[PDB]
Amino acid sequence: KNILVRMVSEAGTGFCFNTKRNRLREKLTLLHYDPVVKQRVLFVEKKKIRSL
Amino acid sequence: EFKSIYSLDKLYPESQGSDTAWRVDIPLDRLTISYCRSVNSKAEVRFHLATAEWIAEPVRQKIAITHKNKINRLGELILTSESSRYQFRNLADCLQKIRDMITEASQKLHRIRIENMNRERLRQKRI
């Protein structure tokens, strides 16, 4: 199944956004727009929010 | 007269004289100010740019170049504000525009650029 995860910005900001990834799939690292920084920055998966 | 520990003289011992609280660059007398109750009103500030001795000569030249669209045939720079119901705020905006113009004097267009480039390209006939 899929799990909702909290991608947390690697830019030092507290900005986090939620994505969906397969449980069997590896932890996610993804480029995403940082509104506070106003630039695309890397985000890393921190913790599993739920299992959907 | 009553005075507590929080009296102003105790709070700010350095400034204690009564006159200390009431002891007092664009020349408002030189400027000409008009108000039109046109809803926002309108304030117009006009002054002869050339004879503005309170403005430096190079600054006057730069202003007359850059803001030539706001200069009347009489050579007087005219600028208006209509962004408030209060003529106070409109006049404040006009004065701030004057200050900003002086400061910058001290220190859509894409299609126009392309058409001017095409005009220069067509600019080939030499008598």
């Binding site: - | 009553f2 929080y6 102003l8 700010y12 400034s15 609280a21 007092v24 106070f88 705020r89 404040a92």
Partner: protein, 287 residues
């Protein structure tokens, strides 16, 4: 008038001639007769006819509209928000022009209330009066006014006319006393000290740009010149004015009334002011 001549012609007005003004007394409707009896306007059988229809807001079991909407803090802390009654410069000029407020004396909340220019409700969390820029372009009065909040434009208008404005804080108790001093004097209590502003309001009343009553008076000329420069008027030297003493008069930050000190008791019955002389009481009322 011709009406009084008609009265002269007519019979004597007595308690047998009186009639209510037509249209002021609707007929009473009661459930008797064919039209208003029988089911008496209640309808056929059911909850509504029995008089037992469910409460207001009930929707027959469907989750009610007023409950299915999420809770949001629209009114959180509403009763602790400070309220300031607006006093526009239009209203102030109107009061001065009609003589209900005397500009020759310092204008404070007591004078505004006594002239009926503003109505303050301390019980409804009114913390005083806020000066409002409305009418600034036509304000032409030289006044010494003490308010609780003041907009930059209102301050500019007051000062351009050659006047003085100061923002002074009043706690709810002092505010009630200031707004209605006579009932307080009939309470027979010594005049209390005016409390200091709460910590959140302290920067406002210590800022000179607000003309705060706790602000450094040394910084007042600089702020006044800044406003004059911003709004394009020449700052008048009020020290040269013949009313400069009145314009300079300011009550002490712990003082509720201009000429009365904290701790005094106003005996209105025989027109006297009893003043404590005990050293402890004097220290307390001066602190």
């Amino acid at each position: 008038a011709r009406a009084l001549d008609l009265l002269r012609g007519l019979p004597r007005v007595s308690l047998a001639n009186l009639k209510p003004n037509p249209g002021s007394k609707k007929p009473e409707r009661r459930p008797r007769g064919r039209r208003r009896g029988r089911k008496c306007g209640r309808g056929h059988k059911g909850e509504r006819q029995r008089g037992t229809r469910p409460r207001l807001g009930f929707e027959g079991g469907q989750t009610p509209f007023y409950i299915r909407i999420p809770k949001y803090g629209f009114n959180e802390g509403h009763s602790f928000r400070r309220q300031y009654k607006p006093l526009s410069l239009n209203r102030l000029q109107y009061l001065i022009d009609l003589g209900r407020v005397d500009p020759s004396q310092p204008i404070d909340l007591t004078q505004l209330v006594n002239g009926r220019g503003v109505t303050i409700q301390p019980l409804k969390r009114d913390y005083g009066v806020q000066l409002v820029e409305e009418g600034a372009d036509t304000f032409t009065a030289k006044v010494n006014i003490e308010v609780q909040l003041a907009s930059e434009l209102a301050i500019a208008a007051i000062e351009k006319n050659g006047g003085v404005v100061t923002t002074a804080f009043y706690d709810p108790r002092s505010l009630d006393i200031v707004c209605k001093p006579v009932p307080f004097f009939l309470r027979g209590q010594p005049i209390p000290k005016r409390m200091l502003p709460p910590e959140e309001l302290v920067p406002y009343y210590t800022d000179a740009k607000n003309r705060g009553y706790l602000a450094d008076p040394a910084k007042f000329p600089e702020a006044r010149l800044e406003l004059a420069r911003k709004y394009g008027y020449i700052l008048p030297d009020i020290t040269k004015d013949e009313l400069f003493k009145m314009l300079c008069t300011r009550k002490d930050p712990r003082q509720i009334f201009f000429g009365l000190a904290p701790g005094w008791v106003v005996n209105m019955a025989d027109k006297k002011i009893l003043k404590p002389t005990d050293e402890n009481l004097l220290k307390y009322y001066t602190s």
